[PDB]
Amino acid sequence: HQPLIARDGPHPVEQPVHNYMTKVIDRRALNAAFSLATEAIALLTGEAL
């Protein structure tokens, strides 16, 4: 709701454009990963004990 400094003189009239402007959200990935070896698969489950 922008201000108005509504004028004197015969210059024509101010008009409040109380507009709704939109925006747009982006989308991002942010990916991460980690290894796991060929052992510790039987381990951390209960196979090779």
Add this chain to the structure above:
Amino acid sequence: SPVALYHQLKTGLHPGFGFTVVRQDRFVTENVLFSERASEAYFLGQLQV
């Protein structure tokens, strides 16, 4: 010749000399194993596949 000596033996005639025979029989036997009390070591481990 080897050809002549093929041709003398089937008829049957002693060709100036003789031979010797070397061969191999084989015999399955039941052996007997005495042991002393404390001889071997034979340790043990762990079981998983």
